[PDB]
Every structure is written in structure tokens, then in C-alpha cells.
Amino acid sequence: PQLHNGLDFSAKVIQGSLDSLPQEVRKFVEGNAQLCQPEYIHICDGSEEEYGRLLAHMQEEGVIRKLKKYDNCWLALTDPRDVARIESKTVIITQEQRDTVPIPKSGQSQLGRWMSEEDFEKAFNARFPGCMKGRTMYVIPFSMGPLGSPLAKIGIELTDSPYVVASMRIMTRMGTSVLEALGDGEFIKCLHSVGCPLPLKKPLVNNWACNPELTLIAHLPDRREIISFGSGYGGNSLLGKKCFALRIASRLAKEEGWLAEHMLILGITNPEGKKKYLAAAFPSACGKTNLAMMNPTLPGWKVECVGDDIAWMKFDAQGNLRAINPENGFFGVAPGTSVKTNPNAIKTIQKNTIFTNVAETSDGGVYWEGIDEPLAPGVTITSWKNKEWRPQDEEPCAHPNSRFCTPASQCPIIDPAWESPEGVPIEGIIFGGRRPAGVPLVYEALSWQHGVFVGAAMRSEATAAAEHKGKVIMHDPFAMRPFFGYNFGKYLAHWLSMAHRPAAKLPKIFHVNWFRKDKNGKFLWPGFGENSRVLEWMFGRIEGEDSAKLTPIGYVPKEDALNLKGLGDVNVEELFGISKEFWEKEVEEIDKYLEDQVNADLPYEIERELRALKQRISQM
Ligand SMILES: Nc1nc2c(ncn2[C@@H]2O[C@H](COP(=O)(O)OP(=O)(O)O)[C@@H](O)[C@H]2O)c(=O)[nH]1
Ligand SMILES: [Mn+2]
Ligand SMILES: [Mn+2]
Ligand SMILES: [Mn+2]
């Protein structure tokens, strides 16, 4: 009810009907409409018609450009201040800090950013009231995972950015069919605003609405709410990806007995017609997308992509670990993507794809560093800064975090079961990162508990994913450091508890390093499609082949166990060398890290593995 006309936003709905929404969806929409005060409300139906008008609208506003060279591809150029997912502005709200992060022993926690309810209410009320003035509030009903899938979860994102709507249509299942599937069911509440109410008080750069100063990405697992303000870029605004599928989801999985992980999923078929599914957790910019879409160099081997970033996993009745990709597309880094590195990505992004902050060629194409493709005579390049760009300048023409947003269905090697609601059985889990020294090409864990320790001990050199710079080696256990939804110590115990499941078929756990370098700073391993040779060894090890040698850090391939034909010039000694001096140092850093960062919440079995690894090394 009401005594005036300030609560019924029906007159501002320009597509859809507040009446057709489930009760709790309407309250969520109208309540924030009253708080944010949008000029219009647009309930997305996910149709092609809506998508086409949205793109046309953004093209008329100067928000996106049409890439004439390709089929329905578009380029967005962001404010240079809003070009990446901001980890320092990402917080998780719980009544108790210990629910979100372990209480460090000495210093500040790297496993998460906790904020109290009281502090968040002050930050929230300082940002959102009236933040959508003069703008349209889009209502995105989206499903993470195939509709009707047992591991699928439904969310509603409210946003004032048509760029977010278009991207969410690619990255999720979005439209009217989700509302019908949701019914009166529970849903994750996602609220997003670029934080630029009209009239504008700060001139917009590149027609990119954003509020860097007030940027804040908040998670409230207890209330099932994601609240993001100030940024329109990727992980900050596509709330189903990191905020939902990893942070919120990891907490739900802990409660409900499954796993939400930062893992690609790929199926691999060998020359004998046997096919296995693998999952791999690498930190950002460490090769998940290249591995998941690999073009294998070994004849008779086939790699198929289920997903390249997020895996939701759960043991089924038979004891198999089943995984689904909850996403609907790929949001991959553009630079470095070439025909020789990731030809399957090139084939995917040639249509129905949105590019952000890559360079544009004069003939309506895209360009970026590492594309490894010559341009025709006369073709000029416009940088992501919307300026004439020559290869002689030091400015890269594409931002290092530039992106393509492409539908997964267009991947030529998309797995025929990538949308199966039952998921795919995982028989192996891979951990890895950028280690320039010490860590061999591949080793296999000695047990489940050691495997969990291997994931917890993961380290990798600073890349260009968050706001980290320089050449530093940091910890990123399970490749989840930016994404833990709850106490990491409890996360370890959750992983360890899977070994207690009856009839559980635990997958083998491997650790790979594509990035070891020699004394000259040159990669010892060619990588890319050649990684199929490493997958072949894992494949045989899962079948039980006696191809492993025992070392202090785990099992490594026997001599001549790796198919190295066609290479031969590879320095195998330095590539699999295990140095006592290096690993003595490695255990100590892991020890100091786990002791400080996990402290009282470190499971004993993890501490035992650390002690056991320290002992085996000391006997070298
Ligand atoms: N040396 C080497 N580099 C790689 C390999 N795979 C990927 N890369 C590089 O790592 C960067 C990011 O790769 P990407 O697949 O997007 O990583 P993701 O963010 O985990 O999906 C790209 O620029 C690639 O050139 C590899 O096997 N060897
Ligand atoms: Mn990722
Ligand atoms: Mn990627
Ligand atoms: Mn145990």
C-alpha cells in the first residue's frame, strides 16, 4: 500500500511488469528503486530483440563502437581508472571476523578483507542513495549453471549500466526463462551501480561512467547479497562471476557439502578412445584459458573445453567428483592471444563478442600485444586510449587487462557435455602458477592430504590481474586468495574432509609449472599445445601406469616417461631438477606463511604434511 505515489514504480517500468515478478523479486527491485531513484526500470527478458536495441542504444550514446570487420562484435573503452578488478576494495561482511578470515598471528590477513556490518552500513548509505538518478535500472535475472541443474543457482542483478547487461547476457543464462524457473525460490541479491547519478558532477572519461574514489565491492553471505559500487569493469560489475560464483558460492558450498573453485574444466581423449575430465586451478594470467582450449600437438589426442575459470563440484551418489562450469561464456585476457598460442580462442571471438580496451584497426578489427598477426598495408591502429598508436611508442595499444567477452557455445572445441546438468566426472586436479625457479615441470601428490597441502602452498609471481605490480612471488593457495568466501583454515578442513566421504573416488592431484626459467631468463618449457605431453603423463598416472619416480616433493615422471619426441633440445635436467637448497627455503616460507596467515585454524593434517615435507627434504 501507500498514502501517496512514492513507492509504486510501475509507471517507470519501460519493459516488463513488476506484477509478473515473484514476490521477493519485486520487493528487491522496488526497495532499491526507492533507494537508488532510477529514472526508468527495465526488466530484462534476455531476448535477441532486447540485446540488439541495447547495443544500438550504447552505440548511440558513444559507449561502444561496432567492429565492422567482424560479425556482431563491439568495442568498449573504459575510464583508465576503472580497468580491472580491485582487490583492496573487495570486502566480506560477517558479524564475526573469524568467519571470513583466520585471525593472523602477527600481521595483516592476505586471505580476505573483512568489514563489520556497522562499517558497511556507513559505507553503503554514503554511496547508494540516489546513485541511479536519471539512469535506467536494469533487472537481470540470471542462472549460474544450466537451468534446472542440481548445482545451478539463480541471481538477480540490479544495475544502471547497459554494458553490464550485455556482458551478463554472454557470461550467464539471462532472461525471462530464469524468472519462470526461479518461481518463489531463493535467489542471490546483486546490486550494482557505477555511482554517477545525473546530472554529472565529474566529466566522464571515454563515456565510461565510474566512481573510483567510492569504489567498493561488498559480499554479505548471511544475507545472500552482493553490493558493488563505483566500477563498471569485469569482476566488479559482472556480479555472477567472482562475487557470486566464487566468494558467495564457496561459502554456500561449505554449508552444503560441495566446492566452488577457481578452476578450468577440460575433457581429454587419448588415442585409445578413453576420455577423462581434469580440473586445473591457476592464478589469473597463468594459463587456464590456454590450457582449457589447448590445441594438442600430440597426434590422436583431443582436448575439449568445459570451462576456463570457475568449477562447481560435488560428489555424486556413486562417489565421483562431478563438476559443472556455472558460466555461459569466456571473459579472457586479450593480449597474448594469437593463432599460435590459442587458435581456438581466435575462432571463438570472431563474432557476437564484446571487447574492452583492446586496440581498433582502421578496417574495423581488433589488435593487442602478442596477437602475432601482421596488418595489411595502410591499416592504422587506435589504442585503447582512443588515440593514434604506432609500434614506436612505449604505450601499449591494448591495456594489459583488456578482455574479450565471448559466448562459450561458439568455442569450436566446447565439450559436448559443457551444459550437462549432471556435470562431468573429475579424475584429476591440477595446481600451478608462475614459478621462475626451483619448481619442476610436473609432480604428483603422495596422497589426498599432501595434495591439499600442495594447493595450500601454491605460490606464483606477480602478474597483471589485480593491482599487484613488480617481480614478486606471492602466495595464492588453490588460486583462491582473492576469492575465499570464508575462513581459509575452514576451507582447508573442508577439502580434507572429502577423504572421509564413503566410497569417494578422490581424483589425483598434480602440480605443474609451465614457467620455469634457466639462468638466462629463458623458458625451459615451450608450453601451450606442448603441454599435451604433460597431460598425457597425468592421463597414464590416473590409469595406474608405473611411470612415476618418488622424490621428496612427490612423484615425478620416470626417465623417458614423458613423450619428448619432436623436441629433444629441451634441457630435461634443469627442468626437473630438485634442489635441496631451494626447497629448504620454500618450506620455510610456506611454514611462516601458514603459521601467520592461518594460525589457530590450520588443520593438523596440513601441519603434518609441512612437517613431513621438511623431513624428506632434510634427508636429501
Ligand atoms: N610460457 C607460457 N605462457 C603461457 C602458457 N599458457 C598461457 N601463457 C601466457 O599466459 C598469459 C595468460 O594466459 P591465460 O590463458 O589468459 O591465463 P588465465 O587468466 O589463467 O586464463 C597469456 O599471455 C599467455 O601467453 C604456457 O603454457 N607457457
Ligand atoms: Mn579467474
Ligand atoms: Mn582466463
Ligand atoms: Mn583426515
Curated annotation (Swiss-Prot):
Induction: Regulated by cAMP, dexamethasone, glucagon and by insulin. Dexamthasone, glucagon and cAMP increase levels, insulin decreases levels. Mn(2+) binds at K242, H262, D309. In eukaryotes there are two isozymes: a cytoplasmic one and a mitochondrial one. The modification N6-acetyllysine is found at K68, K69, K89, K471, K519, K522, K592. Its cofactor is Mn(2+). Binds 1 Mn(2+) ion per subunit. Pathway: Carbohydrate biosynthesis; gluconeogenesis. Residues 455-485 are annotated as: Omega-loop. Monomer. It catalyses: oxaloacetate + GTP = phosphoenolpyruvate + GDP + CO2; L-seryl-[protein] + GTP = O-phospho-L-seryl-[protein] + GDP + H(+). This is Phosphoenolpyruvate carboxykinase, cytosolic [GTP]. One of its GO terms (cellular component) is cytoplasm. It is found in: Cytoplasm, Cytosol; Endoplasmic reticulum. Phosphoenolpyruvate carboxykinase activity is regulated by acetylation and glucose levels. The anaplerotic conversion of phosphoenolpyruvate to oxaloacetate is improved by PCK1 acetylation on Lys-89 (K91ac), Lys-471 (K473ac) and Lys-519 (K521ac). High glucose concentrations favor PCK1 anaplerotic activity by triggering acetylation on Lys-89 (K91ac). At low glucose levels, SIRT1-mediated deacetylation of Lys-89 promotes the cataplerotic conversion of oxaloacetate to phosphoenolpyruvate. Phosphoenolpyruvate carboxykinase activity is inhibited by 3-mercaptopicolinate. GTP binds at A285, C286, G287, K288, T289, N290, R403, R434, F528, G529, E530, N531. The keyword Oxidoreductase does not apply. GO terms for molecular function: carboxylic acid binding; GDP binding; GTP binding; magnesium ion binding; manganese ion binding; nucleoside diphosphate kinase activity; phosphoenolpyruvate carboxykinase (GTP) activity; phosphoenolpyruvate carboxykinase activity. Cytosolic phosphoenolpyruvate carboxykinase that catalyzes the reversible decarboxylation and phosphorylation of oxaloacetate (OAA) and acts as the rate-limiting enzyme in gluconeogenesis. Regulates cataplerosis and anaplerosis, the processes that control the levels of metabolic intermediates in the citric acid cycle. At low glucose levels, it catalyzes the cataplerotic conversion of oxaloacetate to phosphoenolpyruvate (PEP), the rate-limiting step in the metabolic pathway that produces glucose from lactate and other precursors derived from the citric acid cycle. One of its GO terms (biological process) is cellular hyperosmotic salinity response. The modification Phosphothreonine is found at T176. It holds the Pfam family PEPCK_GTP. Belongs to the phosphoenolpyruvate carboxykinase [GTP] family. InterPro entries: PEP_carboxykin_GTP_CS, PEP_carboxykinase_C, PEP_carboxykinase_GTP, PEP_carboxykinase_GTP_C, PEP_carboxykinase_GTP_N, PEP_carboxykinase_N. Substrate binds at R85, Y233, G234, G235, S284, N401, S402, R403. SUPFAM superfamilies: PEP carboxykinase N-terminal domain, PEP carboxykinase-like. Its EC number is 4.1.1.32, 2.7.11.-.
